[PDB]
Write a protein that binds this DNA or RNA. Structure first.
Ligand SMILES: Nc1ncnc2c1ncn2[C@@H]1O[C@H](COP(=O)(O)OP(=O)(O)O)[C@@H](O)[C@H]1O
Length: 714
RNA sequence: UUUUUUUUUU
């Protein structure tokens, strides 16, 4: 049984005043723990802090238009006040009211901006669709609530949906049920299985069978042999997804269940798409295995909806599947409406036979109407049987699937509480991008083998709480395990994405010179526009500009960098007209206001069609993805006060390692020198002749110089 | 040295 009581968490959350900016005892995170008690004492307050800051952010950011509810009933359940309330069905569907949402119920008309009004924090417990109404079961804290005497039956209130706490509930569930985990010892001690050394012959055999390099084959062999935690660190372009697919085939060699998880839906979708192509066992046989995606069809790729469990169950139930009775009733009533005036006229004119016939027809129509009305009154048992058939179909589909892919929170769904399933082996992708409690979620189903593919050198998980991030809540389990046992981590050491000039600096400065380029990589990234000196594989443009707060005091904008980016795109496109660039260019900037300004100006000049040829994004919203050419706007321009979160080397590495063929960086050096590694990058660009300064708008206004003929020979 | 930034939710 792995269903802990959610009373404590719900009470802690419902005992909050919404009007504060922004309990508990938040401490630092240790490397190891002796007992689940210490683990809980460390991580529960940090979870509460993260939840609190997420709630404040969602309150300030939400824009759900309020709506009126009618209080139908009030009850006391546990230590909570339960209020059933009626809501219009269309309003409910528009605002998406489901079980677990956090809402503000107020008496005033604008609840979000009326603290002095009768307000309360409530959690949705059940949503029941009747006909044109929705019965919502709100649950609030029964200790100290202003609206408690005012929620009498019939009283009307105004509600606004703030956020949802399903993810928090699942992470708390995993936290409280950790004490029964098969891998509890390894999770507490952060101890992965020891590094295995294999013979070069078996390594070469795996390489030949799966078309892998030595590091990937070593990682796969250690994932097949070792039990417990196996850590695989995959720098950019090292082949993480290919390794995972070959590893899934390798583990299923015997079977021919396996739970592949990722923190985001995008990574899950990529893994599903790659596993749909098919795996191959170590025997060398190609098998099109059964890949099953778990999640709602709204956050799921259009290409993987063919293998989504929900879609499969819906398709199966659509074959087994009162309104015709209503149609016939309408038609018989129309016949009655026809017959009645005819009968009245035949009776008002002393027409014996005609009135007799019409009365006979009238009586037959009334008989049919009574029959249809009796049948209409004839469930709910059919609905229950449909739900039972749904459950059966779910189980039957799950039992035939060999690999199940999911998000971390999605793998802790309530569904599995009524489905007999165990996941012996779990592979967590993007292992360094999720907090520890999220990683623990898929491990409650009897997992004794966990392969963590990640990269702590890139971005950490989103921790809105600056205090919890300072306490160490932004540390993934991967990071702690590698912190304690670094020699047991399998590093993928060969990248196949960046031109050697692009990868040169990150490899040395972030991967200790251990990230080597693949064979024939410079020749693979050879592009025609590299013949232009200023359009080479890698370059830093010292765009001396000025930073400025975005609209509504958002983030930062550098209009000169936007102008230079437009000028660079114009020069490149004009000097190379015959190159198909659709989907080959990306423009990334770590500040959202600069991103919006870049998109705005590019659409002003080139129209909305420009977004099909250029991927506009922020540095954080680009991880895992890549483009042929990357224009990187640094935005920061104030020579004092630092460069903000530009100082974090993980974000810098992510931003530098997105490009394949060309990376063109635009930054005001006078400000960026404040950061140590940005200074090192600018100096490196200088001492290798990849730095350009002066009037950049003028240097890009004309077609620029070409590279020497002798350099192209080599 | 003024975090302003991202995942998650049947
Ligand atoms: N041994 C290899 N030889 C040649 N190319 C490889 C090898 N391993 C990986 N690659 C290339 O690297 C790519 C890795 O894809 P992906 O897993 O998305 O990279 P990332 O590690 O950035 O997620 C593959 O598409 C493949 O073309």
């Amino acid at each position: 049984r792995l269903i802990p009581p959610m009373d404590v968490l719900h009470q802690a959350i419902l005992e909050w005043d919404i009007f504060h900016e922004g309990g508990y005892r938040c401490g630092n995170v240790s490397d190891t723990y002796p007992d689940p008690y210490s683990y809980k004492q460390t991580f529960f307050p940090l979870l509460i802090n993260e939840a609190w800051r997420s709630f404040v952010t969602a309150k300030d950011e939400t824009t759900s238009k309020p709506f009126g509810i009618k209080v139908l009933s009030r009850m006391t359940v546990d230590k909570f006040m339960e209020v059933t309330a009626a809501v219009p069905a269309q309003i409910s569907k528009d605002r998406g009211l489901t079980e677990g949402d956090i809402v503000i119920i107020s008496k005033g008309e604008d609840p979000l901006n009326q603290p002095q009004e009768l307000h309360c924090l409530s959690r949705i417990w059940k949503t029941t669709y009747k006909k044109d109404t929705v019965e919502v079961v709100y649950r609030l804290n029964a200790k100290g609530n202003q609206i408690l005497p005012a929620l009498t039956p019939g009283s009307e209130f105004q509600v606004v949906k703030i956020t949802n706490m399903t993810t928090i509930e699942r992470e708390y569930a995993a936290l409280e049920s950790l004490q029964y985990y098969d891998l509890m010892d390894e999770i507490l001690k952060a101890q992965p299985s020891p590094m295995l050394t294999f013979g070069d012959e078996a390594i070469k055999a795996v390489m030949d069978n799966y078309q892998l390099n030595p590091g990937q084959a070593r990682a796969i062999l250690n994932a097949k042999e070792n039990d417990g935690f196996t850590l695989i660190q995959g720098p950019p372009g090292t082949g993480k997804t290919k390794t995972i697919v070959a590893m899934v085939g390798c583990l299923l060699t015997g079977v021919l269940k396996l739970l592949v998880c990722a923190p985001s839906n995008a990574a899950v979708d990529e893994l599903v798409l790659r596993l749909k192509a098919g795996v191959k066992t170590m025997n060398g046989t190609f098998h099109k295995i059964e890949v099953l995606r778990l999640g709602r069809s709204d956050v799921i790729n259009a290409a993987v909806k063919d293998v989504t469990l929900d879609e499969l169950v819906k398709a199966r139930m659509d074959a087994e599947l009162r309104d015709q009775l209503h149609k016939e009733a309408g038609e018989i009533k129309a016949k009655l409406a026809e017959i009645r005036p005819q009968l009245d006229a035949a009776r008002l004119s002393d027409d014996r036979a005609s009135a007799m016939k019409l009365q006979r027809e009238f009586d037959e129509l009334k008989r049919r109407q009574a029959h249809i009305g009796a049948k209409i009154d004839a469930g709910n048992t059919y609905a229950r049987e449909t739900e039972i058939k749904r459950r059966q179909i779910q189980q039957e589909i799950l039992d035939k699937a060999q690999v199940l892919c999911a998000t971390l929170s999605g793998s802790g769904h309530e569904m599995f509480k009524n489905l007999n399933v165990e996941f012996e082996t779990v592979i967590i992708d993007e292992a360094a991008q999720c907090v520890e409690l999220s990683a623990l979620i898929p491990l409650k189903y009897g997992c004794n083998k966990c392969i963590l593919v990640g990269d702590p050198k890139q971005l950490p998980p989103t921790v809105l709480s600056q205090s919890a991030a300072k306490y160490g809540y932004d540390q993934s389990l991967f990071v702690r395990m590698q912190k304690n046992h670094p020699k047991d981590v399998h590093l993928l050491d060969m990248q196949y994405r960046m031109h050697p000039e692009i990868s040169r600096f990150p490899s040395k400065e972030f991967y200790e010179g251990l990230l080597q380029d693949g064979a024939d990589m410079a020749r693979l990234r050879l592009q025609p526009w590299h013949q232009s000196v200023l359009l080479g594989p890698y370059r830093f443009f010292d765009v001396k500009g000025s930073q400025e707060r975005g609209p509504k005091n958002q983030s930062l904008v550098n209009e000169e960098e936007v102008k230079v980016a437009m000028q660079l795109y114009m020069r490149f496109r004009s000097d190379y007209r015959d190159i198909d660039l659709t989907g080959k260019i990306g423009i990334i900037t770590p500040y959202k206001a600069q991103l919006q300004r870049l998109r705005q100006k590019f659409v002003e000049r080139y129209g909305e069609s420009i977004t099909e040829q250029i991927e506009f994004n922020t540095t954080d919203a680009f991880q895992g993805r890549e483009c042929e050419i990357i224009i990187f706007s640094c935005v920061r321009a104030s020579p004092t006060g630092g460069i903000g979160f530009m100082t974090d080397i993980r974000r810098m590495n992510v931003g530098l390692t997105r490009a394949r063929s060309s990376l063109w960086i635009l930054g005001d050096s006078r400000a960026l020198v404040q950061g140590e590694f940005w200074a090192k990058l600018i100096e490196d660009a200088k001492q290798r002749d990849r730095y350009t300064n002066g009037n950049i708008m003028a240097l890009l206004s004309q077609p620029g110089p070409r590279v020497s003929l002798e350099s192209l020979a080599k």
